[PDB]
Amino acid sequence: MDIISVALKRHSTKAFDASKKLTPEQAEQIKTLLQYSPSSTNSQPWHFIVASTEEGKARVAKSAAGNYVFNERKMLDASHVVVFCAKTAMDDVWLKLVVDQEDADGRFATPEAKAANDKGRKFFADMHRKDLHDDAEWMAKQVYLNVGNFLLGVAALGLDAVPIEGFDAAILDAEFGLKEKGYTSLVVVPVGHHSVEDFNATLPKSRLPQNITLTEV
Amino acid sequence: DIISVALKRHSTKAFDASKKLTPEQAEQIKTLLQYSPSSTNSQPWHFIVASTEEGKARVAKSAAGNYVFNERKMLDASHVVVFCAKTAMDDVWLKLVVDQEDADGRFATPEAKAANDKGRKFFADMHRKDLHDDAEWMAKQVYLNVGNFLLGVAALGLDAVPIEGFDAAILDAEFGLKEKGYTSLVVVPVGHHSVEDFNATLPKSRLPQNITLTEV
Numbered sequence: 001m002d003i004i005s006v007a008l009k010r011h012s013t014k015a016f017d018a019s020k021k022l023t024p025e026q027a028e029q030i031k032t033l034l035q036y037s038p039s040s041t042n043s044q045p046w047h048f049i050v051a052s053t054e055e056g057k058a059r060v061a062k063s064a065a066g067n068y069v070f071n072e073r074k075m076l077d078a079s080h081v082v083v084f085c086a087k088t089a090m091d092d093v094w095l096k097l098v099v100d101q102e103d104a105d106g107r108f109a110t111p112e113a114k115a116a117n118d119k120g121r122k123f124f125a126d127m128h129r130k131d132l133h134d135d136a137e138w139m140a141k142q143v144y145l146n147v148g149n150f151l152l153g154v155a156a157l158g159l160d161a162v163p164i165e166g167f168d169a170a171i172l173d174a175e176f177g178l179k180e181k182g183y184t185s186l187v188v189v190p191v192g193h194h195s196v197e198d199f200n201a202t203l204p205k206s207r208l209p210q211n212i213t214l215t216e217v
Numbered sequence: 218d219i220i221s222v223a224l225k226r227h228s229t230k231a232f233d234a235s236k237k238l239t240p241e242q243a244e245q246i247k248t249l250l251q252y253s254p255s256s257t258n259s260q261p262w263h264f265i266v267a268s269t270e271e272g273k274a275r276v277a278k279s280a281a282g283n284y285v286f287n288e289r290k291m292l293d294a295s296h297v298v299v300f301c302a303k304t305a306m307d308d309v310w311l312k313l314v315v316d317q318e319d320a321d322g323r324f325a326t327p328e329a330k331a332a333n334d335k336g337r338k339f340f341a342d343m344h345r346k347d348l349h350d351d352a353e354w355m356a357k358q359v360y361l362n363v364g365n366f367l368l369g370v371a372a373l374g375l376d377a378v379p380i381e382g383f384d385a386a387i388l389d390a391e392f393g394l395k396e397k398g399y400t401s402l403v404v405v406p407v408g409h410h411s412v413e414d415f416n417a418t419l420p421k422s423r424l425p426q427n428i429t430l431t432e433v
């Protein structure tokens with residue numbers, strides 16, 4: 001069925017059925033979804049942690065403490081749990097890595113075309129790095145775009161999920177040693193299948209009317 | 218299959234100005250923008266959809282400086298959507314959201330409505346008072362909407378291209394969204410690519426998972 005039907009019917013799951021795992025093929029597909037999301041200048045300023053074992057999810061679940069105990073069950077009961085992370089700083093060695101990958105994938109007919117791409121990426125990278133001083137926020141924006149792509153995609157695969165901002169990033173970061181690796185956790189997304197306990201599965205979806213949020217010209 | 222569309226979609230560099238969206242597709246595009254999820258269902262956004270040649274030209278003005286090469290995408294495309302984020306989360310917006318959820322029957326009792334409003338106010342207060350990042354927090358929700366939109370339109374058989382290469386100050390002044398309490402973030406022309414689009418035949422490139430993904 002069309003994505004409009006998927007968009008109108010998907011929902012944030014409030015409780016997962018821990019016995020319903022992703023199929024082996026589905027496990028590979030969600031990884032493909034994560035990698036192929038678009039990003040400004042194809043910068044891909046991200047890293048993903050995909051927890052599928054009881055041990056792995058327990059380590060992620062440490063972040064659902066304090067005022068976030070509300071999300072612990074979700075992190076432990078879902079089949080797979082994805083931690084979306086953003087680079088803490090945009091370094092030149094990474095920018096080079098991106099251009100070389102496009103080059104190796106055959107996107108530049110001449111060594112001038114490749115040089116033109118590195119320059120174009122350098123323009124935006126420096127605009128945020130040197131002038132605006134918001135490269136951390138710029139990269140986080142790309143990660144959130146990835147989350148959006150990911151949420152609709154998994155729903156399209158007939159999978160349930162829930163985006164989570166309610167977790168302790170410092171706790172999660174320390175658990176997986178992300179700071180020293182050059183990353184920071186932003187959004188946690190448990191994916192699997194909802195249980196009968198998921199009260200949100202049967203409730204009507206609510207959104208502000210278009211006359212308030214949309215202008216046609 | 219959604220994996221097929223994720224692997225086949227691409228950023229179109231040039232649109233065929235002859236291919237316009239059908240009235241059904243034009244409606245579906247707005248449905249996608251409206252139904253995207255957001256933290257606490259805060260929906261801190263505004264969208265400007267330009268379908269007329271005059272409307273599109275107004276948007277295209279934000280690319281007259283160092284972004285001249287982006288004007289053609291904005292004019293040749295059937296529909297052009299500029300994603301805007303609120304500049305500040307106000308109690309008036311917070312009430313509109315919870316009252317709308319109430320109208321839509323998401324609350325069984327007035328206590329749940331009160332609890333939902335309190336839970337959202339909690340997250341909203343934290344960002345403006347403590348973290349001092351409410352503007353970026355709302356902007357991130359808008360980017361999440363963009364991610365959802367790009368996949369959605371690709372699945373509809375439509376071509377699109379997210380554009381960051383535009384002057385937000387110019388675009389803001391054009392549509393007066395400044396006084397309205399919004400800021401332009403992303404421009405997304407939607408339509409059908411022309412035979413001229415070089416990116417259409419180009420292989421997609423992404424870093425391998427051994428670099429970006431850790432399994433535990």
Ligand SMILES: Cc1cc2nc3c(=O)[nH]c(=O)nc-3n(C[C@H](O)[C@H](O)[C@H](O)COP(=O)(O)O)c2cc1C
Nearest residue numbers: 010011012071163164165166205254255256257258
């Ligand atoms: C960035 C982000 C963070 C979220 N964090 C949480 C969370 O911590 N807990 C939760 O139960 N839902 C969370 N949600 C889900 C939203 O509340 C939900 O998307 C919204 O109410 C609309 O409902 P729907 O997703 O079912 O359409 C989050 C959503 C987004 C976009």
Ligand SMILES: Cc1cc2nc3c(=O)[nH]c(=O)nc-3n(C[C@H](O)[C@H](O)[C@H](O)COP(=O)(O)O)c2cc1C
Nearest residue numbers: 038039040041042145226227228379380381382421
């Ligand atoms: C936030 C954002 C801004 C972008 N801005 C531009 C732009 O100004 N010009 C352009 O040609 N492409 C732009 N793109 C498209 C990206 O360069 C493109 O998604 C990326 O190189 C990956 O290629 P793909 O979209 O074909 O998968 C933008 C993409 C994103 C996510």
Ligand SMILES: NC(=O)c1cc(N2CC2)c([N+](=O)[O-])cc1[N+](=O)[O-]
Nearest residue numbers: 040041042120121123124286381382
């Ligand atoms: N990687 C790109 O697609 C790209 C290339 C250029 N250069 C070729 C024209 C520019 N830009 O210069 O603004 C901007 C982007 N961008 O996505 O932000």
Ligand SMILES: NC(=O)c1cc(N2CC2)c([N+](=O)[O-])cc1[N+](=O)[O-]
Nearest residue numbers: 012014070166255256257258336340
């Ligand atoms: N009570 C809820 O079900 C709830 C709680 C949270 N926060 C506390 C974790 C968020 N949210 O943050 O978006 C959203 C919802 N929601 O209504 O979908």
